[PDB]
Design an enzyme around this catalytic site. Structure first.
Site, short mmCIF file in Angstrom:
data_model
loop_
_atom_site.label_atom_id
_atom_site.label_comp_id
_atom_site.label_asym_id
_atom_site.label_seq_id
_atom_site.Cartn_x
_atom_site.Cartn_y
_atom_site.Cartn_z
N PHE A 1 -14.23 -99.45 4.33
CA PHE A 1 -13.96 -98.22 3.55
C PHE A 1 -13.34 -98.58 2.28
CE2 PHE A 1 -12.35 -93.56 4.11
CZ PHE A 1 -11.27 -93.56 3.40
N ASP A 2 -13.34 -97.90 1.24
CA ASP A 2 -12.77 -98.17 -0.04
C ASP A 2 -12.18 -96.98 -0.95
OD1 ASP A 2 -12.43 -99.95 -2.55
OD2 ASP A 2 -14.16 -99.32 -3.14
N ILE B 1 -23.93 -98.38 -8.95
CA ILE B 1 -25.04 -98.33 -8.34
C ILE B 1 -25.80 -97.07 -8.86
CG2 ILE B 1 -24.67 -99.48 -6.33
CD1 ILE B 1 -23.64 -96.60 -4.75
N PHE C 1 -19.56 -91.20 -0.29
CA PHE C 1 -18.47 -91.19 -1.29
C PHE C 1 -17.99 -89.81 -1.47
CE2 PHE C 1 -18.65 -95.44 -3.56
CZ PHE C 1 -19.82 -95.76 -3.26
N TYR D 1 -11.88 -91.86 -6.19
CA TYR D 1 -13.19 -91.98 -5.44
C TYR D 1 -12.50 -92.88 -3.94
CZ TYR D 1 -13.95 -97.19 -5.68
OH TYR D 1 -14.05 -98.33 -5.49
N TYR E 1 -27.54 -100.56 -2.45
CA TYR E 1 -27.75 -102.08 -2.43
C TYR E 1 -29.13 -102.54 -1.86
CZ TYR E 1 -23.08 -101.65 -4.02
OH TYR E 1 -21.89 -101.41 -4.79
C1 LIG Z 1 -20.65 -104.52 -3.76
O1 LIG Z 1 -19.19 -104.68 -4.25
C2 LIG Z 1 -18.25 -103.65 -4.29
C3 LIG Z 1 -18.37 -102.38 -3.91
C4 LIG Z 1 -17.79 -101.26 -3.80
C5 LIG Z 1 -18.26 -99.85 -3.31
C6 LIG Z 1 -19.18 -99.28 -4.11
O2 LIG Z 1 -20.09 -99.53 -3.53
N1 LIG Z 1 -18.90 -99.02 -5.20
C7 LIG Z 1 -17.51 -98.70 -5.61
C8 LIG Z 1 -17.12 -97.61 -6.85
C9 LIG Z 1 -18.68 -97.43 -7.81
C10 LIG Z 1 -19.71 -97.26 -6.92
C11 LIG Z 1 -19.95 -98.48 -6.16
C12 LIG Z 1 -20.41 -99.72 -6.99
O3 LIG Z 1 -21.11 -99.67 -7.82
O4 LIG Z 1 -19.67 -100.73 -6.43
C13 LIG Z 1 -20.11 -102.00 -7.63
C14 LIG Z 1 -19.15 -101.93 -8.34
C15 LIG Z 1 -17.75 -102.15 -8.44
N2 LIG Z 1 -17.12 -102.20 -9.52
N3 LIG Z 1 -17.98 -102.15 -10.36
C16 LIG Z 1 -17.73 -101.83 -11.95
C17 LIG Z 1 -19.29 -101.67 -9.97
C18 LIG Z 1 -18.37 -100.00 -1.70
C19 LIG Z 1 -17.28 -100.77 -0.89
C20 LIG Z 1 -17.54 -100.72 0.56
C21 LIG Z 1 -17.52 -99.21 1.11
C22 LIG Z 1 -18.76 -98.57 0.45
C23 LIG Z 1 -18.62 -98.69 -1.04
C24 LIG Z 1 -16.43 -101.59 -4.29
C25 LIG Z 1 -16.09 -103.01 -4.74
O5 LIG Z 1 -14.78 -103.31 -5.16
C26 LIG Z 1 -13.73 -102.39 -5.24
C27 LIG Z 1 -17.08 -103.93 -4.75
O6 LIG Z 1 -16.78 -105.27 -5.18
C28 LIG Z 1 -16.90 -105.41 -6.52
#
Ligand SMILES: COc1cc([C@@H](C(=O)N2CCCC[C@H]2C(=O)OCc2cnn(C)c2)C2CCCCC2)cc(OC)c1OC
Length: 128
Positions: free
Chosen positions: A55-56, A75, A118, A45, A101
């Site tokens: 961005f991630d 999420i 995404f 992803y 969120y």
């Molecule tokens: C808030 O913390 C983070 C958020 C993110 C990015 C994000 O939103 N996602 C990442 C992939 C899966 C969906 C969603 C999510 O469920 O993420 C929580 C989470 C991460 N690891 N696990 C097991 C669950 C964001 C990042 C900014 C651009 C929009 C998407 C990634 C993170 O770390 C890689 C993260 O920190 C934990």
């Protein structure tokens, strides 16, 4: 760009039909099977705030992102969205804050009331 296309053309895949999770299939996958709740799922992803301030990528560690579907480990929009995907599929999701969120956000990384985008590739899914 990609987010606007999903806004105007994407399929509303919410139960509530509140446009909270919109999807476009960008590349068709294999077979008929989509993952069940509790399946171990493997993806690549890229993601961003629709602002574009953050961005991630799983690509930015060359190793797939792995989680159990439908357990709220990700999420809500992902538990909804990835459940609709076939092995091999690439899809775009656009997500309202209620399915990501929320009003709380996830500061400092995610603001309050953020819309997310995404691109997701479903590599594989395996039974519990
Ligand atoms: C808030 O913390 C983070 C958020 C993110 C990015 C994000 O939103 N996602 C990442 C992939 C899966 C969906 C969603 C999510 O469920 O993420 C929580 C989470 C991460 N690891 N696990 C097991 C669950 C964001 C990042 C900014 C651009 C929009 C998407 C990634 C993170 O770390 C890689 C993260 O920190 C934990």
């Amino acid at each position: 760009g990609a987010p606007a296309t999903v806004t105007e053309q994407g399929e509303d895949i919410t139960s509530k039909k509140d446009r909270g999770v919109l999807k476009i299939v960008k590349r068709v996958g294999n077979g008929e099977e989509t993952p069940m709740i509790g399946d171990k799922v493997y993806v690549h992803y890229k993601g961003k705030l629709s602002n574009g301030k953050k961005f991630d990528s799983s690509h930015d560690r060359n190793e797939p992102f792995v989680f159990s579907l439908g357990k709220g480990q990700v999420i809500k929009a992902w538990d909804i969205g990835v459940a609709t995907m076939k092995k091999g599929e690439i899809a775009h999701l656009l997500i309202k804050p209620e399915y990501a969120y929320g009003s709380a956000g996830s500061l400092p990384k995610i603001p309050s009331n953020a819309t997310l985008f995404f691109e997701i590739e479903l590599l594989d899914f395996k039974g519990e």
